[PDB]
Design a protein around this ligand. Structure first.
Ligand SMILES: OC[C@H]1O[C@H](O)[C@H](O)[C@@H](O)[C@@H]1O
Ligand SMILES: OC[C@H]1O[C@H](O)[C@H](O)[C@@H](O)[C@@H]1O
Ligand SMILES: OC[C@H]1O[C@H](O)[C@H](O)[C@@H](O)[C@@H]1O
Ligand SMILES: OC[C@H]1O[C@H](O)[C@H](O)[C@@H](O)[C@@H]1O
Ligand SMILES: OC[C@H]1O[C@H](O)[C@H](O)[C@@H](O)[C@@H]1O
Ligand SMILES: [Co+2]
Ligand SMILES: [Co+2]
Lengths: 270, 270
């Protein structure tokens, strides 16, 4: 028995994602709960609602099956006009709605799942200003704002700064943490542990992800990752499975069991 | 105690010179033995000799510190002329000397450490013919010939075949096994375990390598790899460390200790 979360993207084939393919998510929530997942990270926020439901109903539904309503992936990128002007004030109204909806749902974190590699350091800097501004507003609402990587953030901008490094270095720790996707970090030739040591404390959440089932490909050193979890600053871990050797239910269950069986995964990080 | 080998390349910096001795490997042999490595893979074959010594002297030296003289990296790429002619006859006499020297040293395996990505499938085919021919000669001297990868072998040739796949598919199992470098496979976006399942029995040795010390980076899933070792066909494992967080002795000892401590690493694979 360990505190292990689940990215609801993992079951998007059953409940949908990012505003589409919707089903009644409640039976799946129950199965995930019964498997022994203890928290959820959502993957379908839109216009004040979660999977089409009010924050109150979503919170109730998640609470009904005994899981923590922990985190949520959602975001709003800057238009080319906002990037060129450096003025992203119109975007902030969307965040007032988003932050109030997350607070009503009980959420502890909000994580932006994706930003494009910008063309220039100046653009990156504007993104940093935006991330700081979002994270500050989140912080005032009692929420921790984070960023989730794929592999593209390990590229360089203007052949100077690695994008993820720039973001980390040019955001305030209390405004932005990194929800590090260890699979995608490895895919971008990055050492998760080396990142942990370069930016201690900034990795408040991990996406525990692999090619398919967690711990099956040989491509991720979860032992080392979890051994350096204190340096990283890990508070919570979120299993993500996007591709499957089996039916989805079994893939996500085997994924949890790997962590439950792993001696290097502690019962709680919080 | 576990049967764990060491690639002598890993301590290339600790093999020095004084007086008439240009490759004084004996002190390092001792140290490696004392750390607890049980077998060596050589990285210095030329002109019938190992580290400038006769096969009998090298064999004596290795045996004197109680390690197995197991394997050896050496190679002879095809010239552009041999590639274009398809006729690699001239290279085969080099192999007669090489194989006889390995037999005199007691070697169980010979492994070629690098072949370039060829431009065409036709050239890849020629390489496979060459590998088959070498492996056949090795086999008749009671030696198993193998191929060691980096990352480049996961590229596609003519945007058709992945190079390593082509090699495996178009060589005889009895002529060629793969000494899979798990670190470099990951660096090529390859799952070691999926390779094991695609080509059962063909990975008779692993190069146990990481970014630096074995098991420290978070980039290699040793647990999964070792759990699939039987499928793979693993007979021996060889630690390789080329880059170091510490002084070389400490780095290669920490590397052994990770495997000695890992419950998923068995005492013997042979
Ligand atoms: O809550 C009060 C404080 O927080 C506000 O968001 C303002 O940024 C700051 O100027 C003010 O003093
Ligand atoms: O931390 C900045 C960059 O340099 C590091 O040495 C790593 O090689 C790379 O993975 C990382 O993106
Ligand atoms: O052959 C000994 C060593 O030398 C080569 O340069 C390879 O990079 C390495 O994979 C090998 O272990
Ligand atoms: O024999 C030639 C063919 O066999 C190889 O194993 C591959 O399947 C294919 O890509 C190649 O063209
Ligand atoms: O083995 C075949 C190739 O295709 C697979 O789908 C993998 O993505 C790749 O790592 C591998 O090289
Ligand atoms: Co993810
Ligand atoms: Co190697």
């Amino acid at each position: 028995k360990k505190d292990i979360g689940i990215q609801l993207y993992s079951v998007r084939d059953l409940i949908g994602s990012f505003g589409r393919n919707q089903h009644d998510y409640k039976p799946v929530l129950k199965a995930l709960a019964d498997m022994g997942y203890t928290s959820i990270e959502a993957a379908s926020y839109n216009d004040g609602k979660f999977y089409g439901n009010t924050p109150e109903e979503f919170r109730r539904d998640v609470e009904a099956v005994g899981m923590k309503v922990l985190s949520s992936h959602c975001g709003k990128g800057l238009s080319d006009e906002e990037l060129a002007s450096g003025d992203f004030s119109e975007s902030m109204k969307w965040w007032d709605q988003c932050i109030a909806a997350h607070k009503a749902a009980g959420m502890e974190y909000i994580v932006t799942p994706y930003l494009p590699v910008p063309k220039t350091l100046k653009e990156m800097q504007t993104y940093c200003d935006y991330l700081n501004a979002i994270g500050k507003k989140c912080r005032e609402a009692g929420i921790k704002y984070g960023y989730h990587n794929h592999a593209h953030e390990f590229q360089k901008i203007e052949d100077k700064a690695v994008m993820l490094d720039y973001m980390i270095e040019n955001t305030d720790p209390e405004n932005l943490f990194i929800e590090l996707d260890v699979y995608w970090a490895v895919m971008g030739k990055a050492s998760p542990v080396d990142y942990f040591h370069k930016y201690p404390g900034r990795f408040k959440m991990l996406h525990i992800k692999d090619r398919r089932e967690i711990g099956q490909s040989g491509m991720v050193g979860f032992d080392a990752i979890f051994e350096n979890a204190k340096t990283a600053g890990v508070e919570n871990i979120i299993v993500e499975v996007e591709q499957y050797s089996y039916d989805v239910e079994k893939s996500v269950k085997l994924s949890l069991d790997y962590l439950l069986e792993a001696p290097f995964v502690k019962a709680s990080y919080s």
